[PDB]
Amino acid sequence: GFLGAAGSTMGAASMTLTVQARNLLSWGIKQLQARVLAVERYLRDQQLLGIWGCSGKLICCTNVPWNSTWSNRNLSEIWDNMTWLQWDKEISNYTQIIYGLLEESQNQQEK
Amino acid sequence: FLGAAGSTMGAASMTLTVQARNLLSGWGIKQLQARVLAVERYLRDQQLLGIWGCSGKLICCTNVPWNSTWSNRNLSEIWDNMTWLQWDKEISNYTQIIYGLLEESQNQQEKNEQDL
Amino acid sequence: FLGAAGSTMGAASMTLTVQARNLLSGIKQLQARVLAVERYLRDQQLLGIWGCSGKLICCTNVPWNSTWSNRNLSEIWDNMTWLQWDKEISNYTQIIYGLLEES
Amino acid sequence: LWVTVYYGVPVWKDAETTLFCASDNVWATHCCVPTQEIHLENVTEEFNMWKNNMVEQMHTDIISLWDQSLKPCVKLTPLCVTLQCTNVTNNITDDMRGELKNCSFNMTTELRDKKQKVYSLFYRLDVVQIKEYRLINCNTSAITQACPKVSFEPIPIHYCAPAGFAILKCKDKKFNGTGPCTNVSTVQCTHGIKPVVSTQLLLNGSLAEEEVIIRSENITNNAKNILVQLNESVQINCTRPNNNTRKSIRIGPGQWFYATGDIIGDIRQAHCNVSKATWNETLGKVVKQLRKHFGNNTIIRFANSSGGDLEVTTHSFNCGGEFFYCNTSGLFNSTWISNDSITLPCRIKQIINMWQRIGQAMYAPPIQGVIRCVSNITGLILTRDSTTETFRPGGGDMRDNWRSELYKYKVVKIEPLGVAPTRCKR
Amino acid sequence: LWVTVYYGVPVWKDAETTLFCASDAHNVWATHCCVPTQEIHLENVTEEFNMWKNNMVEQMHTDIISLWDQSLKPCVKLTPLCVTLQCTNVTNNITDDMRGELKNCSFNMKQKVYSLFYRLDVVQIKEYRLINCNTSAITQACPKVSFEPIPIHYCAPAGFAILKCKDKKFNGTGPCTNVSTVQCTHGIKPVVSTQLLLNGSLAEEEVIIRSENITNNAKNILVQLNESVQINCTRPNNNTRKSIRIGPGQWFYATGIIGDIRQAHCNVSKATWNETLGKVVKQLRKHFGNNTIIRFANSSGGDLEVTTHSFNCGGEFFYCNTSGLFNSTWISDSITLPCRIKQIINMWQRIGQAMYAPPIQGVIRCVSNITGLILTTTETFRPGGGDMRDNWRSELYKYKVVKIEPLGVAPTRCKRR
Amino acid sequence: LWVTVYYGVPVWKDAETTLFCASHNVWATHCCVPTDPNPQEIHLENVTEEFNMWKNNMVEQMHTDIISLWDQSLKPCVKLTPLCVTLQCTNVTNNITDELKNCSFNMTTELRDKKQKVYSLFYRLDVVEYRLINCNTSAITQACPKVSFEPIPIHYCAPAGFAILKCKDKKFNGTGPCTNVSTVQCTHGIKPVVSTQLLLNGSLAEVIIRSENITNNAKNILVQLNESVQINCTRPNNNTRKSIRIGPGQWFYATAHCNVSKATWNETLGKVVKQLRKHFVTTHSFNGGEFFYCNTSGLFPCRIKQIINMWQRIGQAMYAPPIQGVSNITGLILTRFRPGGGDMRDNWRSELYKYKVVKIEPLGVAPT
Numbered sequence A: 001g002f003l004g005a006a007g008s009t010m011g012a013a014s015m016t017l018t019v020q021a022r023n024l025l026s027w028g029i030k031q032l033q034a035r036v037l038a039v040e041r042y043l044r045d046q047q048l049l050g051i052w053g054c055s056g057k058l059i060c061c062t063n064v065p066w067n068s069t070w071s072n073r074n075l076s077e078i079w080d081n082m083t084w085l086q087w088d089k090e091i092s093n094y095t096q097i098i099y100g101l102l103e104e105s106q107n108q109q110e111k
Numbered sequence B: 001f002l003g004a005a006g007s008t009m010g011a012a013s014m015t016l017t018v019q020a021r022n023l024l025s026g027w028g029i030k031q032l033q034a035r036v037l038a039v040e041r042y043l044r045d046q047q048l049l050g051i052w053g054c055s056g057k058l059i060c061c062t063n064v065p066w067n068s069t070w071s072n073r074n075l076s077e078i079w080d081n082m083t084w085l086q087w088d089k090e091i092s093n094y095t096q097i098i099y100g101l102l103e104e105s106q107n108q109q110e111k112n113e114q115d116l
Numbered sequence C: 001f002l003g004a005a006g007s008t009m010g011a012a013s014m015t016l017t018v019q020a021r022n023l024l025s026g027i028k029q030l031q032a033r034v035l036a037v038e039r040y041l042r043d044q045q046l047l048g049i050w051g052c053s054g055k056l057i058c059c060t061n062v063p064w065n066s067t068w069s070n071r072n073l074s075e076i077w078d079n080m081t082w083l084q085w086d087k088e089i090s091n092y093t094q095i096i097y098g099l100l101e102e103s
Numbered sequence D: 001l002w003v004t005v006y007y008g009v010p011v012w013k014d015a016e017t018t019l020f021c022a023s024d025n026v027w028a029t030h031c032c033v034p035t036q037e038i039h040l041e042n043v044t045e046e047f048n049m050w051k052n053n054m055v056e057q058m059h060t061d062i063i064s065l066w067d068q069s070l071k072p073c074v075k076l077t078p079l080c081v082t083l084q085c086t087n088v089t090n091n092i093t094d095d096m097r098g099e100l101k102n103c104s105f106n107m108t109t110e111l112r113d114k115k116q117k118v119y120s121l122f123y124r125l126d127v128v129q130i131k132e133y134r135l136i137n138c139n140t141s142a143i144t145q146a147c148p149k150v151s152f153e154p155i156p157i158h159y160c161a162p163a164g165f166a167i168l169k170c171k172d173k174k175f176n177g178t179g180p181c182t183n184v185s186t187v188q189c190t191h192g193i194k195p196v197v198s199t200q201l202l203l204n205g206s207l208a209e210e211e212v213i214i215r216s217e218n219i220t221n222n223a224k225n226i227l228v229q230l231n232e233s234v235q236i237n238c239t240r241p242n243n244n245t246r247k248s249i250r251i252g253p254g255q256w257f258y259a260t261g262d263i264i265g266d267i268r269q270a271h272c273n274v275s276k277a278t279w280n281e282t283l284g285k286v287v288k289q290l291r292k293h294f295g296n297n298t299i300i301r302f303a304n305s306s307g308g309d310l311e312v313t314t315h316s317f318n319c320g321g322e323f324f325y326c327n328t329s330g331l332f333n334s335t336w337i338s339n340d341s342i343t344l345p346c347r348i349k350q351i352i353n354m355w356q357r358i359g360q361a362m363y364a365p366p367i368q369g370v371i372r373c374v375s376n377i378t379g380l381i382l383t384r385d386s387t388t389e390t391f392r393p394g395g396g397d398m399r400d401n402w403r404s405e406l407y408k409y410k411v412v413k414i415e416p417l418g419v420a421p422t423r424c425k426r
Numbered sequence E: 001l002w003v004t005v006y007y008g009v010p011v012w013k014d015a016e017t018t019l020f021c022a023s024d025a026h027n028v029w030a031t032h033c034c035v036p037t038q039e040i041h042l043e044n045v046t047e048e049f050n051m052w053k054n055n056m057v058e059q060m061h062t063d064i065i066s067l068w069d070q071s072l073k074p075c076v077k078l079t080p081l082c083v084t085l086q087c088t089n090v091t092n093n094i095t096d097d098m099r100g101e102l103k104n105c106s107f108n109m110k111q112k113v114y115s116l117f118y119r120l121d122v123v124q125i126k127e128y129r130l131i132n133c134n135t136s137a138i139t140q141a142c143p144k145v146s147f148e149p150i151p152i153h154y155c156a157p158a159g160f161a162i163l164k165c166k167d168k169k170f171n172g173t174g175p176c177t178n179v180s181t182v183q184c185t186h187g188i189k190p191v192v193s194t195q196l197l198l199n200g201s202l203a204e205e206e207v208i209i210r211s212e213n214i215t216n217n218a219k220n221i222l223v224q225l226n227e228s229v230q231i232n233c234t235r236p237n238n239n240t241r242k243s244i245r246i247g248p249g250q251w252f253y254a255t256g257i258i259g260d261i262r263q264a265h266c267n268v269s270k271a272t273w274n275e276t277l278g279k280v281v282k283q284l285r286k287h288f289g290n291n292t293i294i295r296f297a298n299s300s301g302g303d304l305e306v307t308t309h310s311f312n313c314g315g316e317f318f319y320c321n322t323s324g325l326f327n328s329t330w331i332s333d334s335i336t337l338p339c340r341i342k343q344i345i346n347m348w349q350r351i352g353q354a355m356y357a358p359p360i361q362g363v364i365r366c367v368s369n370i371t372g373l374i375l376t377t378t379e380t381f382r383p384g385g386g387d388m389r390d391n392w393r394s395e396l397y398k399y400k401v402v403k404i405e406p407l408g409v410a411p412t413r414c415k416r417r
Numbered sequence F: 001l002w003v004t005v006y007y008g009v010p011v012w013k014d015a016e017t018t019l020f021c022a023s024h025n026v027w028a029t030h031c032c033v034p035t036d037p038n039p040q041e042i043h044l045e046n047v048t049e050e051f052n053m054w055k056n057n058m059v060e061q062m063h064t065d066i067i068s069l070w071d072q073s074l075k076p077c078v079k080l081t082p083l084c085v086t087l088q089c090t091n092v093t094n095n096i097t098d099e100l101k102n103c104s105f106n107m108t109t110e111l112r113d114k115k116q117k118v119y120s121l122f123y124r125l126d127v128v129e130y131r132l133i134n135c136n137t138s139a140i141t142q143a144c145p146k147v148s149f150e151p152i153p154i155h156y157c158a159p160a161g162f163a164i165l166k167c168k169d170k171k172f173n174g175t176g177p178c179t180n181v182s183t184v185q186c187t188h189g190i191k192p193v194v195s196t197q198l199l200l201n202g203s204l205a206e207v208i209i210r211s212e213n214i215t216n217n218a219k220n221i222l223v224q225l226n227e228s229v230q231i232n233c234t235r236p237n238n239n240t241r242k243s244i245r246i247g248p249g250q251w252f253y254a255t256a257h258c259n260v261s262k263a264t265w266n267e268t269l270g271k272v273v274k275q276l277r278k279h280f281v282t283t284h285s286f287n288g289g290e291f292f293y294c295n296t297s298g299l300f301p302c303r304i305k306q307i308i309n310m311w312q313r314i315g316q317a318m319y320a321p322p323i324q325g326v327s328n329i330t331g332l333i334l335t336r337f338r339p340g341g342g343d344m345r346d347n348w349r350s351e352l353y354k355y356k357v358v359k360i361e362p363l364g365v366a367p368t
Ligand SMILES: *[C@@H]1O[C@H](CO)[C@@H](O[C@@H]2O[C@H](CO)[C@@H](O[C@@H]3O[C@H](CO)[C@@H](O)[C@H](O)[C@@H]3O)[C@H](O)[C@H]2NC(C)=O)[C@H](O)[C@H]1NC(C)=O
Pocket: D153, D154, D196, D198, D203, D204, D317, D318, D319, D320, D321, D372, D373, D374, D375, D376
């Protein structure tokens, strides 16, 4: 199911990432406006993955080291003992930094 | 554009460069709706190829074996005498099986890549 | 948010993501958004028909024919901006697109 | 270690978007979309029914849809003329003395020239003196006749998320509208809400499964509405015992006005019946729950709606398109301490300033024959006025009638992209 | 073998979509058809076509109605004219015909004004009313807007294609074994008529008789000719237009007449008509009997738009008498037809709405091509009527819309890493 | 030697698109999005861009959108159909010096019956045994008081895929190969002030004479001053109004000089004069909420007009309601000298002379 296992730990929930990826694209003017928005959101995410070294992968590895300043926990405290909802909150202040670094990490590979 | 549509699958196996990469070509609300739907269809097909393990290529072979129960036919007909139109009809209600399997296979490949 | 300006070709190679990221950000506005999407997709489809996708820089096996521009590599790549280059080769473009589509 | 990018990550944030409806008449031809829940194990989520954007959106869509209908209908501005009237006083019960009037006037016809004399019946609530009378809402605003072909019967409306969004549902059996919810699930659409319009009492909604639930924002604060969701239901039998006829008047080039015609048989007063014992138990349950916030043997008393306009001080129904205003002071009359039927008289009105607005007025065409309806009371709207606390029927703000069904649902957006440290590098 | 996924596979499904209007570059069709506008033969393709179940016809029908309303929506209303009208007669140099015609009417509108009306525009109760006054209030068409038909091409949106049947003998249903693909249909002129179909396509060969069920005898028969029959129409009465102000920027255009008053009429040749019917009966005989007799007769009855040839030319609305045609028995110089005119028009079956056609200054000279007919032990055939869908079926006849489905799979001798 | 394809290519071309506005005002429902607190202007180093204030679609776009908004408003206001009646009228002797008329008429009420007699005041310019000007020719729509037409600043912003270029050359004359070009996402405030002979508020040149084909034809000269001149405009009447019912909620509202700063006006002219030699609507309108039509007295005495035919159109007359009970000259429009102007496109050409819209074309090829 969609968001099934949302409360499961990180790494457990990820066993089925296709479910939340394949279901993003599914007056009456609101239906047209909704179709346009769904497309825009989808493309913004695909462009973002594509501005990084990522393409068709759901688990893309990139050449950016992890900073202890973003989060410093045992690996078992990331991929167990916690779900994605808390993790997203935990590092919400660094997302824009990581994304900028990912973009540059790829520019450095254009050789 | 649909040239040789009545030709066999074999003959048409090399004609896939056509009928492809051309869907974005150039009250009134009905036309705006038509343009949006054309985009949606374009993206739906590209996402589907993208979620599966191969995209970009016109021809993608994968690691899902062919199950004979989906056709009960072989190469004495397929890619020889049958046309794509007849073929599409012959396996027309097995499509959802194939598609589910293609997604499952790539999801396993993704896990293997994460562990490697 | 383009600052490459008069910088020569090859200087902007590290700003390619700056321009790319700026592309995706009453009825007239709904129409405008749809058109912006279509423009984006046409460029992506075109890169996709050519032998690449998802790249800022793409180089497929289509040789350069100097008849298009009577300048050598140092003469074309350096000492010129992209605006000047585009003007000098505003023609002979559709031919490249065809060759890129063929390979 | 290294940053790894994950797409398809099951996370979300609160969101405000535009929902569209689906369904299995005003709404029947509106949704135009045909009609599965997924339980989320170990997910706690925070809900707040008083800040729920769907309420504002439902209100917005109802008003807009309501106004989309009616707009393409016959205007009754040609009837804003001086009219003369007398009382009917003919085979009446003596409880209608001056309630029903026999009116006549000079009005326009098919041609721009000539004129016609017509007569019709009116309820006192629609007509005011200026034997010389004016219709209400000829003063300000303008009257538009509703098209007889359009039904206003509420049907279930299912609100569905747009792609990229999801609706979370709270299943805790005693959920009081705010705070964390332990049993949470994801749905694509709501359960189907009937857009029933009423005041004071909530009709034809969902019932509590275990016990009466008292929901309010900061209940300690007086001068706030309290929404009471009942366990079990109270059946109400309403009737308008007048066999009516209609007169079709051509007022222009295919423009028709439907006037109230005469009455076949005796003229009788409209009323609603509630079982008395059922009402008695219903309130005992409500009082016991009120005691949790207003405890220490506080005497709890109920009293009537007092002052204000007709829309707020009386109960309001829409049955077959007829509009009833009923006196509920016979229900809210009790004192509770720690130690066969009721008849509520009703009045009928045809010119309606619906949704607490002043720039519009709807004329409700008359209904032929004798109309009756049976409704379920599924809840109450109470307002609170130091001991001997007093509660009165509250209401008039239509958003409160939707919170009573939408409190279980929240809209979130899906943001399936994020990062975490892993053991891989390219 | 392994599953292989293919993209760009040349297959399709029947589909219904939104088509767009295109043309070859103050005309209403042109105003709302602003897209300027090859054919691919499909070798070894058999395709099922059904022109009695064709959404291109229904979509065109809707587009025509919608455009018409958009055009009239902003034009001046004639509400001010629904007053008791006072009418007498015209005896001013009228020939023997048209005695019950052209009544001279005065209005109390204040100002006193007058105009001329056709008899078919008014009813009694010297006390008159306009037709469509009690119901269906009248809107005047804008004099600056032309409704003259232009060729219209219907074009598929991306992802769709239009297939067409090249078989010269196709009767509207069943498989076609000579199929091609196009982007756009040929241009179709949105000509409105009844009984006789004007300015359409001709059959490549002979005469083609088409119906949904030929032995039903409760269906229209569409007859397509391989040659045209010329019709010469005229309204030779040198009319004058009278401009009346009805409000601050609102004008009514009244009929204000020069020379003799003559009956409007249409001519066809005797030989052309006779030969044309001869060919039609030869084909009817392939479906109706053998050693039999075919007779033609005029309409059995109906409203004006059914019993007459509804015809529009110069912007005028004519209702021509075709009983001078279709009056013969078939076994093993010129024809002149009188015409009536109306100014208050109820388009199609829209009884609840009405339009006023302003008068035309001067005279009308019009030449049209009959390209087809609508018809409805010996047998007798009569001209029939319709709701216009049947006229459009004759040009959208050869086309079908299909959706392209570029993805699919097949077993192959290939496995990736 | 080989073909290389680039995507985020720093290239643009002249283009025409629709720009959108950003910030109970009439523009409140248009400029629905605020601008950024940080314009993020980017200097373009080492570039030359051809700018042309003439044949500039931004000016044309501003014009058509303002007309549209103007017409979107008014549309829902009371239509003054029943004012086209014979008006009886007399003079004013009440403390009047060297006008206004005292008039009356038979008017409708909220009901179709019981017609009423109404007394009201009118300005001479609006009255033609009297009728109101143009009442029998064009419908008159009142400008209902619920909407303000105050010319708040507005900013035009590019849609995705487009950018706005700006000319920073202080001596730019409206056309040519401008340098020191910068890129912006939104324009400056370009306050939509409507006038004729003189251009009010907007911005200063910090004098530049700009025109098309100067000295050769009958074209307007747009003069942008380096310094502003303050003009003190008033309407010393203390007018009151009468609100009456025309119909059922249809309310009708029934019922001057400028001091040019002394000396500084002559200094301003002093700056213009002898600059022209380097190359070589009879009144000044306003809106104070009222339309003044002032005489050029001592410039090279105002009169209020209530029924307004604006944007040079005939069929859309507006009725300005009465109002119960300080501008800068920043430029002039001249003709060969006498005041010119009257064309709103020139009024709005000013302040946009420095902007250009270009399309971004993120795709190109070069050898490697
Ligand atoms: C609460 O729900 C009940 C139904 O469970 C609503 O009463 C029903 O209202 C409809 C429409 O007014 C009635 O349908 C009509 O019946 C007559 C019968 O002769 C028919 O002629 C009409 O064409 C139409 O079909 C229905 O009979 C009635 N049900 C009952 C039991 O009387 C009730 O109105 C709802 N409450 C509120 C406030 O809306």
